[PDB]
Amino acid sequence: ALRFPRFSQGLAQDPTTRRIWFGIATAHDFESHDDITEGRLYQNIFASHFGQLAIIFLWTSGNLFHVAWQGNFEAWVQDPLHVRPIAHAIWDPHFGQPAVEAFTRGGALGPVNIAYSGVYQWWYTIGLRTNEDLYTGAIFLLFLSFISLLAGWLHLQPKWKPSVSWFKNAESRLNHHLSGLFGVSSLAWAGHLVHVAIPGSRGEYVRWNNFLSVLPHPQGLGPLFTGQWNLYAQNPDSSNHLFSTSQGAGTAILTLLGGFHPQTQSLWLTDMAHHHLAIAILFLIGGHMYRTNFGIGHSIKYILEAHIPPGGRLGRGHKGLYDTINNSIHFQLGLALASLGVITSLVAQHMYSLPAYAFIAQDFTTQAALYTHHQYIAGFIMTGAFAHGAIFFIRDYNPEQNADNVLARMLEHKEAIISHLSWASLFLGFHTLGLYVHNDVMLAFGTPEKQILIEPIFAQWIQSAHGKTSYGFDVLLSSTNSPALNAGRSIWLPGWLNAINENSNSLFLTIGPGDFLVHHAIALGLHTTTLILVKGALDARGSKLMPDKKDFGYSFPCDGPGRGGTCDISAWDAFYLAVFWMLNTIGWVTFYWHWKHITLWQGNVSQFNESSTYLMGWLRDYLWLNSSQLINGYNPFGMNSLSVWAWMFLFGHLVWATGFMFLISWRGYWQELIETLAWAHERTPLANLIRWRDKPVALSIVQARLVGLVHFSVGYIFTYAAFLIASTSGKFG
Amino acid sequence: SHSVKIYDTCIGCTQCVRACPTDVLEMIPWGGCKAKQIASAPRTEDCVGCKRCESACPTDFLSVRVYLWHETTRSMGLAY
Amino acid sequence: MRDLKTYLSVAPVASTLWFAALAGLLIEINRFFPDALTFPFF
Amino acid sequence: NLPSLFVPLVGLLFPAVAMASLFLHVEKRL
Amino acid sequence: PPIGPKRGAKVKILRQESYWYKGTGSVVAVDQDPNTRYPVVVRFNKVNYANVSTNNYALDEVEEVK
Amino acid sequence: DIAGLTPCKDSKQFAKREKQSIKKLESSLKLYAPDSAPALAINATIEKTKRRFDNYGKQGLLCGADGLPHLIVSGDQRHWGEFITPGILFLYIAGWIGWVGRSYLIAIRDDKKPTQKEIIIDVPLATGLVFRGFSWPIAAYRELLNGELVAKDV
Amino acid sequence: GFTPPELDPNTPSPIFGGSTGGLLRKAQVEEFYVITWESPKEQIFEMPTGGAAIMREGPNLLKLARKEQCLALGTRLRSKYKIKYQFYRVFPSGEVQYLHPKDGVYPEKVNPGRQGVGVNFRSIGKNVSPIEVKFTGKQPYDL
Ligand code: CLA
Ligand code: CLA
Ligand code: CLA
Ligand code: CLA
Ligand code: CLA
Ligand SMILES: CC1=C(/C=C/C(C)=C/C=C/C(C)=C/C=C/C=C(C)/C=C/C=C(C)/C=C/C2=C(C)CCCC2(C)C)C(C)(C)CCC1
Ligand code: SF4
Ligand code: SF4
Ligand code: SF4
């Protein structure tokens, strides 16, 4: 110990500046710290979880506070489609007078930023109506962040810290998460919708003062205990209904209409309340599967032991997988990040196609910002899922306790998995690029008719299968005779078919050959990013080049210039290489989404359908064309409110290019340069009276890869966020 | 300082000791191989981690292994 | 002579001759059958 | 009026105190 | 008695960290001197990552395959 | 027709592209003399444009709203000339290339220096093997049934 | 049995005009090194720190900042010229520590008075998986 970092003696005894960097970069790697035990490991993780929850509650609390203080929420409720919501107020003493003038918008007294997170529509749809309601929620979350820190501190003293056996109680944890954390929370949310949100959506302001007096339904509760639940679905709202008023209001609380509210263009609030209630009670029954202290339930160990196919095509099946995952926190985090990244992308794909918050589909800047945000979030989460999968193989995988099960068999034929992932990436890359270049050459020579435009007929057939008419393939939901259509005409199909064939929303947009080419670029990005992460995770314990890689850990610089050269041979470097492909993949995904919508919102879908089939169209008719108002955020003749993006736009270009220095130039050059600088300081008068207490050295090789990747990613995200919002909000459509 | 280890697969060709630029390796008598000698790392406090010894080992797999550990003034190659 | 023929069999020279013959053939095919997005002979 | 007090308190005074205190702790010896 | 396989026979390399693991090579000399933990000398068709074509292995590290 | 497309012989945008392309070439033609070599070149390009558009419309190509031939690769028998038929032709050629190269590598694998015949091609051996790809789907299929295509235990 | 030669100060140093690659404050407060050799005549030799110096005839003493600089110069003294060499470490207290050649024999030549340090008696691939040393201060190669 003796000095920073107190958890690593070898870092503390470093005489150079490297002591500080590695002390920061390894603060949360509890397993590498000195004198760590399984108890201290789970306990520090437990308290870190509480601290995170406190962070999240405090963050949401602050968001409510500024919307209620400097925001537009009360004025925005009156005009949902004519009021620009306010994020907070701007107080920058570097502002010139015109900067104050151009940034004063949304109907405020001083300069303000226009919020683009969608919390206004979210809070209006759930029942919040006045700034006082937002102040109440902020105090509650500030108080919740307080008790989160309280519980985190509480379980760090003896007799409150639990044993590692308590953390390894998987059966009880799953039952409670499915029953309580998943189901009871969804059940209570359905309760909030049917008490406050739905009546709030009909003109009735239900709050804590009067929620005990009002009835959510005229004949409340009674039918629920009888079985005549259909009385809760009798009188929905008319298709000619105004959200904050009562003209067209009904009295139903649980419906299955299937479409959108025609005015708000968001999902039916009764449908959402019924949805949460149905999935909740489904989670409640499902949360009674595993065995606890009552003599009934399953042993997850025994279920895994019993799933072994005779004939031995999977060897010993899943035997030993229970303890393999229950003892490895990296395995559990890998599964958690994998599932979370999938449902994060699921949220992205559904919030733009099935908007659930009132008056959010018309806020085009908000829809673009939200989809881009979650897709990059999900991309990072997926890279982390595979990163911790490799970390599990190195730090926790016991080959003898996983003998001849499915997990060890993955390693047994690692070459087959990696080679075929390589073939699929090569196939997709060769052909997708080739077709794009072919069409580029055709349009260069002025012969558009010679392009190769393949019709995405399989996804078109699926859209017709959902009842879309634009392609006329006459399958179920699109054909009058299929039983899939007859069984649903009574319920969701009227509203569903009404919404899918509306040419304004984005519920299953019309797709053409341009969409076929972009989706194959997406397949290339997914396959190659998967290839990088899987090859690194399977070759993490060893390779023909370095058969003892597991002894060197997860993150090390290299193995030297011997044996031909072993640069970027660790699994950490595999992650580091895959993040570039993740950013490239999400870049393709979001370039696709933003261009299709920004042409749809402009009513010019033909420009996308005709220009997305060749890459010169992407450079010219998407990036170059939409950058106009952005780059003119400030010109030699003045500026407007888009200047903050024109600046951030260039800011992102700088950080990104700065990362190239850390990624192209490597260490030894900078070490010799620092040596020539240390001599300069020791031989300079006056200044040599100042002595450094940490020896200046060049950044570590792994540190350089990390710093270069962080600059690359920060520039990536900030450059695109600036262009996205400025090109969309500059038009607002 | 960096850790250096010698495994008994060593054939005793004395190549790791010749390539070492800070005199960390030694050749001690042994009875396992034909040259009657094996390598040892008694002065890893001077080891810089160049892995120039591993580049010269003819054994498959290596018989010298340099596991980069806690950095010191000597291991970082500082003249200042 | 035998050494000259052995030089002509080296990888770059064999590649150039092979790819030149291939390039000329595809050029004449697209010269007698230009454009063609499909296989029209069915 | 409150921004005229808290914006410098978090962009000037807070990083000043934070960077100075972290410097003393990082450079401290035992 | 000659310990180990005869010289020239094909051997399946069973050392997991070897460049020729699960592959096959040919025997050169079997050192009959005990206390030698790696007597079997094998020569290989293809060079490893160190441009080396011969290596020494133990008796339980080589399997005779025809 | 299929996927809402209209055949290019029926599409107006398809015929308007042919018109505008030919009229654009004619606009370049008025600048030069009727006996000029650029004139005969532009006239040949116009005739080549008419031939291209007519051939696309004659062989049943489907056109979108953009007046450009869209290809249908679902396997519909009305458009096998757009993918499946040229794809089978490709797979025949690709298998030929791979099978001949494989036959070459097998023939030289027992040489004293197999690397010698990989950087200096044995053209006589190559010329004798290039025509075995003509029957590659047969020779490969038999090697599949006899266990000669895949190396045992690798 | 071998007895290391003690470092004799006032030993002549090669002729050199001075360079910027010499000692720094590390030599004053941390440590520095000193290499000694005999040499037959006055010669020119490239300095591991800067340019060229004139190796004096008879005993020579040269103070450097790093150990690797000493062994590199010694190796060239043993290759280009045919000169034996020793070098030591000098702490700021004045203490001297003999380094190389340790036994008086060069390290590439086997010597019977040497003991094994860090010699594992198994194949390199016979190390254990990292999970078997988890929560311990051990490594799979220290054993
Ligand atoms: C994580 C939530 C959060 C976030 C991101 C922000 C962000 C911002 N706030 Mg704010 N604030 C918050 C919570 C938050 N606040 C809470 C809970 C309160 C009490 C109700 C306030 C009260 C407040 C006032 C009065 C003002 C701001 C202002 C501002 C802006 C200027 C920066 C500043 O003065 O720092 C924030 C200053 C504070 C006093 C907030 C810190 C106190 C709370 C309890 C957070 C706890 C801090 C703790 C010591 C360390 C947190 C750990 C880590 C998460 C940072 C800025 C955009 C100024 C502004 O409007 O700019 C024009 C301003 O006038 N805030
Ligand atoms: C994030 C917080 C923050 C804040 C609140 C400010 C605030 C300010 N900046 Mg600054 N700046 C910042 C970050 C910040 N900056 C960063 C990160 C950079 C690096 C890019 C800069 C670079 C920068 C430059 C180059 C300049 C400013 C200037 C200014 C001042 C211009 C407005 C003015 O005319 O006032 C009044 C102008 C005065 C001269 C009065 C000075 C105010 C008194 C003397 C403050 C007293 C200081 C106090 C005693 C001790 C403070 C430190 C203490 C907390 C330890 C203003 C007070 C300008 C400036 O300072 O003018 C010379 C200017 O030249 N800033
Ligand atoms: C709930 C999710 C989760 C959790 C609990 C963990 C937990 C852990 N991770 Mg992990 N990871 C995750 C997700 C997660 N990760 C994801 C999504 C990715 C993909 C990006 C990764 C990729 C990853 C790698 C490559 C590594 C880990 C490692 C680790 C372990 C040590 C981390 C550490 O102490 O370093 C401390 C972390 C920091 C000090 C963060 C500093 C760097 C950040 C990104 C810079 C901030 C960006 C920028 C400056 C701010 C914005 C700019 C501004 C201008 C606005 C630890 C147990 C490390 C490990 O121990 O391997 C065995 C390891 O090398 N993770
Ligand atoms: C019914 C009893 C119960 C309940 C309610 C909980 C609840 C919780 N436990 Mg716990 N636990 C229990 C019993 C219970 N536990 C028992 C009996 C044991 C002993 C075996 C444990 C042992 C245990 C451990 C070891 C840990 C927890 C942890 C947690 C927290 C998980 C992190 C989180 O908040 O994510 C929230 C999850 C949800 C909100 C539901 C899922 C979210 C879905 C998938 C997506 C979001 C839905 C929707 C689309 C969101 C819309 C977005 C919009 C609202 C903005 C959570 C609050 C962690 C913790 O302590 O953190 C401090 C943890 O480390 N528990
Ligand atoms: C006889 C030559 C030959 C053959 C039969 C194969 C066969 C195969 N390769 Mg391959 N390859 C070759 C050459 C060859 N390759 C060369 C020269 C390179 C270096 C550019 C590669 C690089 C390569 C990669 C990176 C991959 C494969 C893969 C594969 C497998 C999947 C199919 C594929 O993707 O092919 C694709 C073919 C290419 C990408 C390049 C082929 C170039 C030409 C067409 C082949 C060379 C012909 C030769 C010069 C002719 C000699 C004539 C002789 C008679 C004198 C497959 C069994 C994939 C795999 O791992 O399987 C899962 C894979 O990832 N190959
Ligand atoms: C490396 C590793 C790892 C990691 C891994 C991962 C990361 C994985 C993943 C993955 C993923 C990321 C996945 C995904 C998925 C998904 C799926 C698998 C799905 C599905 C489904 C289906 C089948 C569907 C169906 C349907 C329905 C239901 C309805 C509608 C129609 C349809 C058809 C759509 C671990 C740690 C483990 C271990 C170690 C190693
Ligand atoms: S030190 Fe740098 S150049 Fe050398 S092997 Fe390692 S990563 Fe490659
Ligand atoms: S890594 Fe370099 S300094 Fe260390 S023992 Fe090997 S050769 Fe010597
Ligand atoms: S290089 Fe390898 S085989 Fe040669 S003496 Fe050193 S450890 Fe032994």
Coordinates of N, CA and C in Angstrom, one line a residue, chain A residues 382-494:
Chain A
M382 N -23.1 -4.7 -26.3 CA -22.8 -5.9 -27.0 C -21.3 -6.2 -27.0
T383 N -20.5 -5.2 -27.2 CA -19.0 -5.4 -27.2 C -18.6 -5.8 -25.8
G384 N -19.2 -5.2 -24.7 CA -18.9 -5.5 -23.4 C -19.3 -6.9 -23.0
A385 N -20.4 -7.4 -23.6 CA -20.9 -8.8 -23.3 C -19.8 -9.8 -23.8
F386 N -19.3 -9.6 -25.0 CA -18.3 -10.5 -25.5 C -16.9 -10.3 -24.8
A387 N -16.7 -9.1 -24.4 CA -15.4 -8.8 -23.6 C -15.4 -9.6 -22.3
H388 N -16.5 -9.5 -21.5 CA -16.6 -10.3 -20.3 C -16.7 -11.8 -20.5
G389 N -17.2 -12.2 -21.7 CA -17.1 -13.6 -22.0 C -15.7 -14.1 -22.1
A390 N -14.8 -13.3 -22.8 CA -13.4 -13.7 -22.8 C -12.8 -13.6 -21.5
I391 N -13.1 -12.6 -20.6 CA -12.6 -12.5 -19.3 C -13.0 -13.7 -18.5
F392 N -14.2 -14.2 -18.7 CA -14.6 -15.4 -18.0 C -13.7 -16.6 -18.3
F393 N -13.4 -16.8 -19.6 CA -12.6 -17.9 -20.1 C -11.2 -17.9 -19.5
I394 N -10.6 -16.7 -19.3 CA -9.3 -16.5 -18.7 C -9.3 -16.7 -17.2
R395 N -10.2 -15.9 -16.5 CA -10.1 -15.8 -15.1 C -10.9 -16.9 -14.3
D396 N -12.0 -17.4 -14.9 CA -12.8 -18.3 -14.1 C -13.1 -19.7 -14.7
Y397 N -12.7 -19.9 -16.0 CA -13.1 -21.2 -16.6 C -12.2 -22.3 -16.1
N398 N -12.8 -23.3 -15.5 CA -12.1 -24.5 -15.1 C -12.3 -25.6 -16.1
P399 N -11.3 -26.1 -16.9 CA -11.6 -27.0 -18.0 C -12.0 -28.4 -17.5
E400 N -11.6 -28.8 -16.3 CA -11.9 -30.2 -15.8 C -13.3 -30.2 -15.3
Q401 N -13.8 -29.2 -14.6 CA -15.2 -29.2 -14.2 C -16.2 -28.9 -15.3
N402 N -15.7 -28.6 -16.5 CA -16.5 -28.4 -17.7 C -16.2 -29.4 -18.7
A403 N -15.8 -30.6 -18.3 CA -15.2 -31.6 -19.2 C -16.3 -32.2 -20.2
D404 N -16.1 -31.9 -21.5 CA -16.9 -32.5 -22.5 C -18.3 -32.1 -22.4
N405 N -18.6 -30.9 -21.9 CA -19.9 -30.3 -22.0 C -20.0 -29.4 -23.2
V406 N -21.1 -28.6 -23.3 CA -21.2 -27.7 -24.5 C -20.2 -26.6 -24.4
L407 N -19.8 -26.1 -23.2 CA -18.9 -25.0 -23.1 C -17.5 -25.4 -23.5
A408 N -17.0 -26.5 -23.1 CA -15.7 -27.0 -23.5 C -15.6 -27.3 -25.0
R409 N -16.8 -27.8 -25.5 CA -16.8 -28.2 -27.0 C -16.7 -26.9 -27.9
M410 N -17.2 -25.8 -27.4 CA -16.9 -24.5 -28.1 C -15.5 -24.3 -28.3
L411 N -14.6 -24.5 -27.3 CA -13.2 -24.4 -27.5 C -12.7 -25.6 -28.4
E412 N -13.3 -26.7 -28.3 CA -12.8 -27.9 -29.0 C -12.8 -27.7 -30.5
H413 N -13.7 -27.0 -31.1 CA -13.8 -26.7 -32.5 C -13.8 -25.2 -32.7
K414 N -12.9 -24.5 -32.0 CA -12.8 -23.0 -32.2 C -12.5 -22.6 -33.6
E415 N -11.7 -23.5 -34.4 CA -11.3 -23.1 -35.7 C -12.5 -23.2 -36.7
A416 N -13.5 -24.1 -36.4 CA -14.7 -24.2 -37.3 C -15.5 -22.9 -37.1
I417 N -15.7 -22.5 -35.8 CA -16.6 -21.3 -35.6 C -16.0 -20.1 -36.2
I418 N -14.6 -19.9 -36.0 CA -14.0 -18.7 -36.4 C -13.9 -18.6 -38.0
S419 N -13.6 -19.8 -38.6 CA -13.4 -19.8 -40.0 C -14.8 -19.5 -40.8
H420 N -15.9 -20.0 -40.2 CA -17.2 -19.8 -40.9 C -17.7 -18.4 -40.7
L421 N -17.4 -17.8 -39.5 CA -17.7 -16.4 -39.3 C -16.9 -15.6 -40.2
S422 N -15.6 -16.0 -40.5 CA -14.8 -15.3 -41.5 C -15.4 -15.5 -42.9
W423 N -15.9 -16.6 -43.3 CA -16.4 -16.8 -44.6 C -17.7 -16.0 -44.8
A424 N -18.6 -15.9 -43.8 CA -19.8 -15.1 -43.9 C -19.4 -13.6 -44.0
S425 N -18.5 -13.2 -43.3 CA -18.0 -11.8 -43.4 C -17.4 -11.5 -44.7
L426 N -16.6 -12.4 -45.2 CA -16.0 -12.3 -46.6 C -17.1 -12.3 -47.7
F427 N -18.0 -13.2 -47.6 CA -19.1 -13.3 -48.6 C -19.9 -12.0 -48.6
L428 N -20.4 -11.6 -47.4 CA -21.2 -10.3 -47.3 C -20.4 -9.1 -47.8
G429 N -19.1 -9.0 -47.3 CA -18.3 -7.9 -47.7 C -18.0 -7.8 -49.2
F430 N -17.6 -8.9 -49.7 CA -17.3 -9.0 -51.2 C -18.5 -8.5 -52.0
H431 N -19.6 -9.1 -51.8 CA -20.8 -8.9 -52.7 C -21.4 -7.5 -52.4
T432 N -21.7 -7.2 -51.1 CA -22.3 -5.9 -50.8 C -21.5 -4.8 -51.4
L433 N -20.2 -4.8 -51.1 CA -19.3 -3.7 -51.7 C -19.4 -3.8 -53.2
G434 N -19.3 -5.0 -53.8 CA -19.2 -5.1 -55.3 C -20.5 -4.5 -55.9
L435 N -21.7 -4.8 -55.4 CA -22.9 -4.3 -55.9 C -23.0 -2.8 -55.8
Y436 N -22.5 -2.2 -54.7 CA -22.5 -0.8 -54.5 C -21.5 -0.1 -55.5
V437 N -20.4 -0.7 -55.7 CA -19.4 -0.2 -56.7 C -20.0 -0.3 -58.1
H438 N -20.6 -1.4 -58.4 CA -21.2 -1.6 -59.8 C -22.2 -0.5 -60.0
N439 N -23.1 -0.2 -59.1 CA -24.1 0.8 -59.3 C -23.5 2.2 -59.3
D440 N -22.4 2.4 -58.6 CA -21.7 3.7 -58.6 C -21.1 3.9 -60.0
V441 N -20.5 2.9 -60.6 CA -19.9 3.0 -62.0 C -21.0 3.2 -63.0
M442 N -22.1 2.5 -62.9 CA -23.3 2.7 -63.8 C -23.7 4.2 -63.8
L443 N -23.9 4.8 -62.6 CA -24.4 6.1 -62.5 C -23.3 7.1 -62.9
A444 N -22.0 6.7 -62.8 CA -21.0 7.6 -63.3 C -21.1 7.7 -64.8
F445 N -21.2 6.6 -65.5 CA -21.3 6.5 -66.9 C -22.7 6.9 -67.4
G446 N -23.6 7.4 -66.5 CA -24.9 7.9 -66.9 C -25.8 6.9 -67.4
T447 N -25.7 5.6 -66.9 CA -26.6 4.5 -67.3 C -27.2 3.9 -66.1
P448 N -28.2 4.6 -65.5 CA -28.8 4.0 -64.3 C -29.5 2.7 -64.5
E449 N -30.0 2.4 -65.7 CA -30.7 1.2 -66.0 C -29.9 0.0 -65.9
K450 N -28.6 0.1 -65.8 CA -27.7 -1.1 -65.7 C -27.3 -1.4 -64.2
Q451 N -27.9 -0.7 -63.2 CA -27.7 -1.1 -61.8 C -28.2 -2.5 -61.5
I452 N -27.7 -3.0 -60.4 CA -28.2 -4.3 -59.9 C -29.1 -4.0 -58.7
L453 N -30.4 -3.8 -58.9 CA -31.3 -3.5 -57.8 C -32.1 -4.7 -57.5
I454 N -31.7 -5.4 -56.4 CA -32.4 -6.6 -56.0 C -33.6 -6.2 -55.1
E455 N -34.7 -6.8 -55.3 CA -35.9 -6.5 -54.5 C -35.9 -7.2 -53.1
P456 N -36.0 -6.5 -52.0 CA -36.0 -7.2 -50.7 C -37.3 -8.0 -50.5
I457 N -37.5 -8.9 -51.3 CA -38.8 -9.5 -51.5 C -39.2 -10.4 -50.3
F458 N -38.2 -10.9 -49.5 CA -38.5 -11.7 -48.3 C -39.1 -10.9 -47.2
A459 N -38.5 -9.7 -47.0 CA -39.0 -8.8 -45.9 C -40.3 -8.1 -46.4
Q460 N -40.4 -7.8 -47.7 CA -41.7 -7.4 -48.3 C -42.8 -8.4 -48.1
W461 N -42.4 -9.7 -48.3 CA -43.4 -10.8 -48.0 C -43.8 -10.8 -46.5
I462 N -42.9 -10.5 -45.6 CA -43.2 -10.5 -44.2 C -44.1 -9.3 -43.9
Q463 N -43.8 -8.1 -44.5 CA -44.7 -6.9 -44.3 C -46.1 -7.2 -44.8
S464 N -46.2 -7.9 -46.0 CA -47.5 -8.3 -46.5 C -48.2 -9.3 -45.5
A465 N -47.3 -10.1 -44.9 CA -47.9 -11.1 -43.9 C -48.4 -10.4 -42.7
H466 N -48.0 -9.2 -42.4 CA -48.5 -8.4 -41.3 C -49.7 -7.5 -41.8
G467 N -50.2 -7.6 -43.0 CA -51.3 -6.9 -43.5 C -51.0 -5.7 -44.3
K468 N -49.8 -5.5 -44.8 CA -49.5 -4.3 -45.6 C -49.8 -4.6 -47.1
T469 N -50.4 -3.6 -47.7 CA -50.9 -3.8 -49.1 C -50.0 -3.4 -50.2
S470 N -48.9 -2.6 -49.8 CA -48.1 -2.0 -50.8 C -47.5 -2.9 -51.8
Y471 N -47.3 -4.2 -51.4 CA -46.6 -5.2 -52.3 C -47.6 -6.2 -52.8
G472 N -48.8 -6.4 -52.2 CA -49.8 -7.2 -52.7 C -49.4 -8.7 -52.9
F473 N -48.9 -9.3 -51.9 CA -48.5 -10.7 -52.0 C -49.6 -11.6 -51.6
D474 N -50.7 -11.1 -51.0 CA -51.9 -11.9 -50.7 C -51.7 -13.1 -49.8
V475 N -51.0 -12.8 -48.7 CA -50.8 -13.8 -47.7 C -51.7 -13.4 -46.4
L476 N -51.5 -14.1 -45.3 CA -52.3 -13.9 -44.2 C -52.3 -12.4 -43.7
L477 N -53.4 -12.0 -43.1 CA -53.6 -10.6 -42.8 C -53.8 -9.7 -44.0
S478 N -53.1 -10.1 -45.1 CA -53.3 -9.5 -46.4 C -54.2 -10.2 -47.4
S479 N -54.7 -11.4 -46.9 CA -55.6 -12.2 -47.7 C -56.8 -12.5 -46.9
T480 N -58.0 -12.4 -47.5 CA -59.3 -12.4 -46.8 C -59.6 -13.8 -46.3
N481 N -59.0 -14.9 -46.7 CA -59.4 -16.2 -46.4 C -58.5 -16.8 -45.3
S482 N -57.4 -16.3 -45.0 CA -56.5 -16.9 -44.0 C -57.1 -16.9 -42.6
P483 N -57.0 -18.0 -41.8 CA -57.6 -17.9 -40.5 C -56.9 -17.0 -39.5
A484 N -55.6 -16.6 -39.8 CA -54.9 -15.6 -39.0 C -55.6 -14.3 -39.1
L485 N -56.3 -14.0 -40.2 CA -57.1 -12.8 -40.4 C -58.4 -12.9 -39.7
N486 N -59.1 -14.0 -39.8 CA -60.5 -14.1 -39.3 C -60.5 -14.1 -37.8
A487 N -59.4 -14.8 -37.2 CA -59.4 -14.9 -35.7 C -59.1 -13.6 -35.0
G488 N -58.6 -12.6 -35.7 CA -58.3 -11.3 -35.1 C -59.1 -10.1 -35.5
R489 N -60.0 -10.3 -36.4 CA -60.8 -9.1 -36.8 C -61.6 -8.5 -35.7
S490 N -62.0 -9.3 -34.7 CA -62.8 -8.8 -33.6 C -62.0 -7.9 -32.6
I491 N -60.6 -8.1 -32.6 CA -59.8 -7.5 -31.5 C -58.8 -6.5 -32.1
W492 N -57.6 -6.9 -32.2 CA -56.5 -5.9 -32.5 C -56.4 -5.6 -34.0
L493 N -56.9 -6.5 -34.9 CA -56.7 -6.3 -36.3 C -57.2 -5.0 -36.9
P494 N -58.4 -4.5 -36.5 CA -58.9 -3.2 -37.0 C -57.9 -2.1 -36.8

